[PDB]
Symmetry: D2
Subunit: 340 residues, 4 copies
């Protein structure tokens, strides 16, 4: 009813227990260490809440403009929360390595790997278990409800899977209707044929050859999308994650983004990329903080494996919407884009 | 002693209770409303923790260079936390006024005035109870709990950061009349500097330019009378224009004059961070009023008029600025050539 | 053709002239003072360029969804540029007051009042000359092309005037069509009548009276918008700037913002408010910097009039879209809003 | 000497020439493209100015506390400018790929490689020419102008901030074998500390726990061999893992151990700011590659394949990090109780 009761500050503000204080040798910065983590976990709970609601709205045959606006609003909110979480790292960096050394021994069985909510965010966004650098990540959890939650987050459709189903059903790709993919192939042939005819008229012979070489590079780019087998091979080696039809829809969305009907679906894709990039930015800032606190290896780490694992999470293997970042590779000028 | 147990996530993550969900009409954004406030309250607890530790270090006769560096580190930490809290406002602003309307009726007896930690931060920094804008109810009357009232009473009576910083400034080495005797040398430097300015102003060819400089030199003399005449300083303190004791103000001025000197650089950084904290609390106040206005306007159903909004706008005044004196110290500055040279 | 030539760095990077260096007594921070101002002026030129293009798109009878998206994009860009300009103040604050004192004497005839581009931004956004705290601001400019530019920025329709014409023509306000204003008045009567009937059933008599008192406060709020004469009086005393019909359109936009047809026009209004608030935030950060460099008064200022003028620019007199900030005062719950 | 004349806005504001406008097909966003780059180049000139002044202060036998404070102030200023430059990327990202396509063809001979000031910042900070990733053309070959080539050559041969910081670290008071003799005391402290760790590990009841601790103590001994055996340090320097001389590394380690001490706090802040600058240049590199990829993908018409994109991705490696050694100093830290006590 009143402020403190509505926010349950009785419970919230009685969850801070400094172990160095319990051992009668308090380290002032352990309080900051606890509060920073607790602020991360409150926001992880909010991100999970937003993600689950967006997954429910995406797990439907009909995705109208009203629901699309609501998804864009909540993805944008997650982007703001992730920027705030990236800014929480310089606050914990204000703790000196020597002060952290005076209480890190009490952490002992605790590990960053034991954050159930961080794993739930990764899985709900779409981090594939097979693409993780590897004890299996889920083995760290001994609690049955924690194991159940992890297992459910892996088997339930992730934002990656749901966004792909939505992209596959993009109105415009329909061969009976607008038939975008076929028109796009013809536009590429017409555009590239004109580029070859224009390259021949070049005065300097070195400039004529550079353009003919460049046009061949373009043809190889278009073979990677117009030949389903070349796309499938790229998917197999981890270079792509999207189904061939989801990729077609994402490309069409980027081509018509200035059109009122395609502007919000394009904003939805942009925010997915921003979320992906912000998670990587948190990963990078976290490794820099780990290195400034305890170096690449310290007493208690048993070598540099922990640090090296953290550095390997910065690879494109942990990027969920990897395909979205490369879509501008397939773009042709406005004059060559098939008219709506 | 695993991650979840060490951080007591059993307790921390079971403190979210949506009242709209309890009334069988859940509003999705109520969860954001609760989480945002809980993140503010966790950081308020950290700011209180840092403030209390800084107050203990300042409540001592001996404030060495090692303790000064530690105070500067923790004040800088509070600055970073306050910038983060200012950035939490745009997150809550993603909630639309219509969605907030569907759960604000459950808030009913709850009020932002009931945040004990926010009041504790204000009092521990140094907001005087007499300088608060009041339309009816005293700020402490909002708390019915005896331990909350006791905490508020203790934060008012215990020395604030404002009081403790003043005692530290009064004991500034350099002000000692037996030693460096800064205040007297400063007065002589002002006379020598201003007398030279008058002699230079007389040589001006244009009469309009000669008069502007003589008028400006008189403005300077009035500025220096406000600090060299203790009675003029005392009157400014009485009308709320100043908060510092005359000797604390002398110390603060001396610190700004010699900030480039190794011995005065950390004490100047300590003062700069107090100003930054003051300024950041005002920035949070401004962003909060903008958000309040965009959510419920200047008045809405349930507010009984515009007094809440008008009260929030009045907290943006210099009445709520704690280290008000620090912001105006450059008014008393003279050029490097005129500053009394340090011996050692 | 090459990088330096395309960006005219020959010209751009030969515009830095330290007067303290010319007088054989260089002050290192004068370089920062010049560069900071020059970076402000480059971005002021960009803001003016964006504003003029938005004014051209708004000065048309037909404002379609395609043009609305483009205006929202460029207003958002101006918001990002203004946040960057606010962040340039802490960079100049790194210069100590004593170092600024060693070169401020060379500034002499130069004044912040002589920034033609800052005045052009204020006028193009919509700062009324009559609402300025006052030598007239335009008297500071002796150059004929500068005076012409200022005069043109005052007489040409500002973003404030153009946004109002666009709001007046809002489809939905048409008495022949949707007729929003009349339906809104009826909804307010029905909603408030129900609030009175519900207030009577209250168990505590003190709670019943608070609600009846609150309902009367609501009726006085609605009289300020449903009685054109009360709106006109508020406009006369500077409390409002919008025409009665522009205000009706802005209110309707906020009520239906979740609807696909009203989402971009609402984003346009939100960005106008963000721009207004960011200009005020720059004004506040600028006065704080002025005070930390030269106090409320210093040698050369002839008293505190300069500082006091800067503090008076922080008032609602300099806020252009003042009306937009108070629109939530008129809101009724979703169930009471007239259905589209 | 009015505002516009003092800032030479006649010159500054007549440097914007849209090539799409010259070809009678203007693209509105080309103006943003030019202005953004011109704002970067103004700030690059400021960073170069600050760097050159810091290099002059560091190129001296006597580096007093007054000059150290001034270096810390200007390095902090460069940090703020770099954070602002990182924030200029989202502004240019508001330009759509299709609009950039309508004017990118006019850019033709222009290249980001032709920014002389960006190369000057890299070289003055300390990026070694041998550590650069090269696919064909040397980075300096991109410049046809003799004065540009001369500037690049001078920035490579003149002592960089990396070289100057190392000379300053070598002369660290405390390393002197006649005086405090830190390095030898540190080696003894490591032996005493590790020997006690071995004796404590033997008392463990569980055999698996006793072995983990003995394995960990061996990892520590290998870490200390990498710094106490000059040949192991020299091999790491040869393979690019380290850049510092063995004595510069000793000084940097000593500074981190005593950072809480008044005499070591500003030298530690100097090192922290060098790391922050290094890190912020990498953050700009990352944001720039993301923007390049969102505008023109990994390859587009006119790029002749993906070599440009692939080169930009390779600049994110530790090969381009100048003060690489500073980031790993906490690997050598021992607890406070084991750190050799300072005499004076
Ligand atoms: C004093 C600062 C910190 C240090 C020294 C540190 C250190 C580490 C280390 C060494 C690991 C790998 C596991 C291990 O070997 O123990 C790790 C993982 C992790 N940490 Fe931190 N950490 C710090 C702060 C934080 C903060 C503030 C958070 C936020 C919740 C966090 C979240 C995580 C997460 C979620 C992982 C797993 C990352 C992944 O699997 O990709 N850490 N950390
Ligand atoms: C939906 C957003 C919010 C609205 C509409 C809102 C509204 C208000 C109102 C109207 C008051 C005055 C008391 C009253 O008349 O009820 C107030 C005071 C206050 N609010 Fe908020 N608030 C919001 C978010 C927040 C957040 C996120 C915090 C952070 C903890 C907060 C902290 C406070 C505090 C501490 C006060 C007292 C300020 C002072 O006395 O100077 N509010 N708020
Ligand atoms: C060392 C820092 C600065 C100081 C001490 C300073 C001081 C002042 C003063 C005293 C005035 C009032 C006119 C006068 O009495 O001379 C003023 C006005 C102004 N300054 Fe600054 N200023 C500083 C930096 C800046 C910067 C970085 C900009 C950005 C372009 C700027 C833009 C302006 C503008 C546009 C005005 C007019 C504002 C208005 O009319 O509302 N100033 N400044
Ligand atoms: C529309 C946005 C931009 C695109 C598409 C873009 C693209 C590129 C590409 C492709 C290269 C490699 C050279 C080439 O193959 O042509 C490059 C290099 C470079 N660009 Fe950009 N750029 C953009 C914006 C910027 C901005 C705003 C700056 C700031 C001054 C900048 C600075 C540089 C620099 C200095 C390099 C060399 C980097 C290094 O050698 O590590 N670029 N850019
Ligand atoms: O993984 C652990 C951990 C353990 N050490 C550690 C390092 C050196 C010597 C002793 C101990 N650092 N980190 C960990 C625990 C907790 Cl409670 C939180 C956390 C967030 N990231 C990681 N974390
Ligand atoms: O002061 C209250 C409050 C009550 N209304 C409100 C407004 C309009 C119609 C109904 C209700 N808004 N705010 C308040 C409660 C809580 Cl729980 C938190 C809070 C943080 N700032 C303020 N807060
Ligand atoms: O208005 C002037 C000014 C003049 N003084 C000043 C103050 C004290 C003693 C001597 C001189 N400060 N500011 C001014 C010039 C320039 Cl070039 C730029 C500027 C941006 N804001 C303002 N500015
Ligand atoms: O390197 C060039 C460049 C050329 N293209 C480009 C890409 C695709 C098709 C046509 C052209 N993009 N970038 C470049 C020029 C300029 Cl003026 C500035 C710049 C800052 N980074 C890089 N830049």
């Amino acid at each position: 009813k009143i402020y403190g009761e509505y926010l349950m500050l009785d419970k919230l503000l009685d969850a801070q227990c400094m172990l160095s204080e319990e051992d009668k040798r308090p380290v002032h910065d352990e309080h900051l260490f606890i509060i920073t983590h607790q602020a991360y976990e409150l926001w992880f709970k909010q991100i999970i809440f937003e993600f689950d609601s967006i997954r429910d709205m995406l797990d439907a045959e009909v995705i109208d403009e009203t629901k699309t606006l609501e998804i864009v609003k909540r993805l944008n909110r997650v982007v703001l929360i992730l920027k705030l979480l990236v800014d929480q790292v310089p606050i914990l960096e204000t703790m000196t390595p020597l002060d952290f050394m005076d209480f890190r021994k009490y952490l002992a069985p605790a590990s960053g790997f034991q954050s159930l909510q961080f794993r739930l965010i990764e899985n709900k966004l779409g981090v594939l278990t097979e693409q993780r650098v590897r004890q299996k990540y889920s083995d760290v959890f001994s609690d049955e409800e924690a194991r159940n939650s992890i297992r459910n987050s892996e088997k339930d459709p992730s934002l990656l899977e749901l966004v792909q189903r939505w992209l596959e059903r993009t109105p415009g790709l329909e061969e009976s209707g607008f038939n975008f993919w076929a028109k796009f192939q013809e536009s590429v042939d017409r555009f590239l044929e004109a580029q070859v005819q224009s390259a021949m008229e070049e005065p300097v012979e070195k400039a004529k050859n550079y353009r003919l070489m460049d046009i061949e590079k373009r043809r190889e780019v278009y073979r990677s999308i117009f030949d389903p087998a070349v796309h499938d091979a790229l998917v197999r080696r981890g270079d792509r994650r999207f189904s061939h039809r989801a990729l077609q829809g994402a490309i069409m969305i980027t081509f018509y983004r200035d059109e009122p009907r395609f502007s919000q679906p394009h904003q939805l894709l942009t925010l997915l990329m921003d979320i992906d990039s912000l998670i990587t930015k948190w990963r990078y800032n976290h490794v820099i903080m780990v290195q400034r606190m305890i170096g690449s290896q310290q007493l208690g780490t048993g070598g540099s494996s922990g640090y090296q694992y953290l550095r390997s999470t910065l690879s494109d293997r942990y990027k969920v919407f990897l395909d979205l970042f490369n879509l501008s590779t397939f773009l042709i000028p406005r004059e060559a884009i098939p008219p709506l």
